[PDB]
Amino acid sequence: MKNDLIRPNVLSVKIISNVSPEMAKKLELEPHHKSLGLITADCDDVTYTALDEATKAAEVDVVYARSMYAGAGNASTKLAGEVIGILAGPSPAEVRSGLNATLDFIDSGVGFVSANEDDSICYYAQCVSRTGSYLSKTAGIREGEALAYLVAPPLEAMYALDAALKAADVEMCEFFAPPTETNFAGALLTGSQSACKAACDAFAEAVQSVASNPLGFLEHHHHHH
Amino acid sequence: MKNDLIRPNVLSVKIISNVSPEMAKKLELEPHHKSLGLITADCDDVTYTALDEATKAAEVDVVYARSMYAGAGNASTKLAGEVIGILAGPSPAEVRSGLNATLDFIDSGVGFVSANEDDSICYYAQCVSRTGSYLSKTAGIREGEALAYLVAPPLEAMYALDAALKAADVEMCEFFAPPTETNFAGALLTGSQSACKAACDAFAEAVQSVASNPLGF
Amino acid sequence: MKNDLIRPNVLSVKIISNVSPEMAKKLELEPHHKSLGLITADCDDVTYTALDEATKAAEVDVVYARSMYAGAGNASTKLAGEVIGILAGPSPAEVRSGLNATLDFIDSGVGFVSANEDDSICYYAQCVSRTGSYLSKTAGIREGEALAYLVAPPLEAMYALDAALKAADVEMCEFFAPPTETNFAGALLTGSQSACKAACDAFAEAVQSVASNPLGFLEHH
Ligand code: NA
Ligand code: NA
Numbered sequence A: 001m002k003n004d005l006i007r008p009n010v011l012s013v014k015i016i017s018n019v020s021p022e023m024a025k026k027l028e029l030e031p032h033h034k035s036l037g038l039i040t041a042d043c044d045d046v047t048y049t050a051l052d053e054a055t056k057a058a059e060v061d062v063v064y065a066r067s068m069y070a071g072a073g074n075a076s077t078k079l080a081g082e083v084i085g086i087l088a089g090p091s092p093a094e095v096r097s098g099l100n101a102t103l104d105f106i107d108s109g110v111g112f113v114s115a116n117e118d119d120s121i122c123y124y125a126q127c128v129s130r131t132g133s134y135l136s137k138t139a140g141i142r143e144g145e146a147l148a149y150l151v152a153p154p155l156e157a158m159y160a161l162d163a164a165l166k167a168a169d170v171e172m173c174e175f176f177a178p179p180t181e182t183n184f185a186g187a188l189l190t191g192s193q194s195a196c197k198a199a200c201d202a203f204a205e206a207v208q209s210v211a212s213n214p215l216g217f218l219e220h221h222h223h224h225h
Numbered sequence B: 001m002k003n004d005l006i007r008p009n010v011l012s013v014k015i016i017s018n019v020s021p022e023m024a025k026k027l028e029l030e031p032h033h034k035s036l037g038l039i040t041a042d043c044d045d046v047t048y049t050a051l052d053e054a055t056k057a058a059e060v061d062v063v064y065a066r067s068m069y070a071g072a073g074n075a076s077t078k079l080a081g082e083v084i085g086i087l088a089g090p091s092p093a094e095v096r097s098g099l100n101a102t103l104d105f106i107d108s109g110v111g112f113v114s115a116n117e118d119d120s121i122c123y124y125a126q127c128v129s130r131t132g133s134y135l136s137k138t139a140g141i142r143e144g145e146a147l148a149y150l151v152a153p154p155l156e157a158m159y160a161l162d163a164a165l166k167a168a169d170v171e172m173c174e175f176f177a178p179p180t181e182t183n184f185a186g187a188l189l190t191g192s193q194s195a196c197k198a199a200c201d202a203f204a205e206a207v208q209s210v211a212s213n214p215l216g217f
Numbered sequence C: 001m002k003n004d005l006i007r008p009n010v011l012s013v014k015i016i017s018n019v020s021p022e023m024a025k026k027l028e029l030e031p032h033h034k035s036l037g038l039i040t041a042d043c044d045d046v047t048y049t050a051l052d053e054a055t056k057a058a059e060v061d062v063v064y065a066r067s068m069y070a071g072a073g074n075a076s077t078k079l080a081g082e083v084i085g086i087l088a089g090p091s092p093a094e095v096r097s098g099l100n101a102t103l104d105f106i107d108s109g110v111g112f113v114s115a116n117e118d119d120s121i122c123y124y125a126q127c128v129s130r131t132g133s134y135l136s137k138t139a140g141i142r143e144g145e146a147l148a149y150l151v152a153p154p155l156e157a158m159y160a161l162d163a164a165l166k167a168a169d170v171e172m173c174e175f176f177a178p179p180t181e182t183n184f185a186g187a188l189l190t191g192s193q194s195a196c197k198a199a200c201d202a203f204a205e206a207v208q209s210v211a212s213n214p215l216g217f218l219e220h221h
Helices: A021-026 A044-057 A092-106 A133-139 A154-167 A193-212 A216-221 B021-026 B044-057 B092-106 B135-139 B154-167 B193-212 C021-026 C044-057 C092-106 C135-139 C154-167 C193-212
Strands: A010-016 A035-041 A061-067 A083-089 A112-114 A122-128 A146-152 A171-176 A185-191 B010-016 B035-041 B061-067 B083-089 B122-128 B146-152 B171-176 B185-191 C010-016 C035-041 C061-067 C083-089 C122-128 C146-152 C171-176 C185-191
Touching: A010 A092, A010 C154, A021 C154, A021 C171, A035 A044, A035 A092, A035 C154, A044 A061, A044 A083, A044 A092, A044 A122, A044 A133, A044 A146, A061 A133, A083 A092, A083 C154, A122 A154, A122 A193, A133 A146, A133 A171, A133 A185, A146 A154, A146 A193, A154 A185, A154 A193, A154 B010, A154 B021, A154 B035, A154 B083, A171 B021, A185 A193, A216 B010, A216 B092, B010 B092, B035 B044, B035 B092, B044 B061, B044 B083, B044 B092, B044 B122, B044 B135, B044 B146, B083 B092, B122 B154, B122 B193, B135 B146, B135 B171, B135 B185, B146 B154, B146 B193, B154 B171, B154 B185, B154 B193, B154 C010, B154 C021, B154 C035, B154 C083, B171 C021, B185 B193, C010 C092, C035 C044, C035 C092, C044 C061, C044 C083, C044 C092, C044 C122, C044 C135, C044 C146, C083 C092, C122 C154, C122 C193, C135 C146, C135 C171, C135 C185, C146 C154, C146 C193, C154 C185, C154 C193, C185 C193
Parallel strands: none
Antiparallel strands: A010 A035, A035 A083, A061 A083, A112 A122, A122 A146, A146 A185, A171 A185, B010 B035, B035 B083, B061 B083, B122 B146, B146 B185, B171 B185, C010 C035, C035 C083, C061 C083, C122 C146, C146 C185, C171 C185
């Protein structure tokens, strides 16, 4: 029901030690990247946030991060979910430390929030109060700066992004144009921690507004047609 | 059943007034684009045709129009459908007018047509007698020229495009290479209005032929 | 159940006898490509292998070959499946010959194999002993050289590719980065037929290992 947290789930985790050179080349790894940590889950943006948290916890870089077409509910196999993440580090021990931090974050209480009775509309409005190396590079900001990580379905996201930008002293960093692979959209915005929180609150309120009344236009403006 | 119209449905409509400069930049809006009209629906090509119609009905441009991966039946949320369209114009009045025209067209009787008993094969074969400013740009043709807008599933579309091109003096302007995001295919063809209609008729007949006999070669 | 073949199915096949010049342009056909053979099926990588086999059997080229977003189980229409392939040749007879070779290969016993009890994890580990003109070009190798054609879901594929590369005397040719349209991943690897076979066996073993222990990563490395 509305305001319920949708629990995210990790599906698979593995380590590759001493990554083969042939794979290192196709993944465009750095010379010091000797080991990989692999993860899949049923929620991509929670996982991306978790991977960023991993870069604060261990000597790891996010070297691969992609979402699956049409999202987890349309996965055709058990472990595909809707995201694959790859951490790289100098040793299996560092990768292992990174993956443990990732897993712990995914199960920390974060998640998309439901906007209606059957959870058929949901959104992410996460204040990342201290970015790691992954999301700061994605956003083009300095490490440790704050972000509003805003995700919703396509029309809700566009409407609510406008609301969020107007509500808060925040800057556009990265636009997720609709559709991304999972048919969502949104943005990374930056500013002070209080401004990012204000943007998150406004984004959430705007998504809920659309969910509650998606076709109000018909009665107000399409009458006598 | 065969020849039934599949009714297209609008799922959500919203307007943005005084669009934020940050969003204007990311959408690559023009300076006169102050207001946005947003729409989602469960049929993308009908919506694209309707958005083009709106540019003839109001002072609006189609500034964004994209389809969802794997189509409306695989939507994971209620309002995603399989298309998002954005109209831009100088005022809320003009984008409401544009949306009203879009809605009218979507409800006008246009739509995908079923080619079999359980409506599991369908196609779009729509003659656009006079393009607006959106489908003329997509096709790379002069504004106001006619189009045949032809869509079907991948193999049906390739087979039926062949038939359409042979049936009248038309040129292929834009090829929708399989898969588009919704796993369809097709093309925009141009020529005289009567040639485009002949192409539409041939396209429809060819899709029906494949539906009736999918493995016969 | 585990080790079961998942049988691939052909959904539609048609011939265009004299392709129109407008269609030839958009498909970037060459002048000698007069006839087209169209096929869809519910298994893309089996079909790609089959199309390559067709080029060995007949004077046909693979001129178009693409997978559908989210795979055959999410198809919204009857004939879309998860792949469209197009053969081009000099005549309808030659295209028909190519299509027959394609269909025969699809039904030959090749296919994805289940890695668990409800067939919810599967993989492809096919040794192409002698490539035709399609997969040799895709891989960037001489026509007639061998490939391991390795496909699995995203994490399994990455883990199992590393295993295959370490186990077998093979080289990386083409990386299918996750996700491809059907949300799979994998690679084409080349080497002797022996080495390609060893890569296939190691890939299969590694995918099965992940299926049996999907969350396990704490063991000594
Ligand atoms: Na589905
Ligand atoms: Na090796």
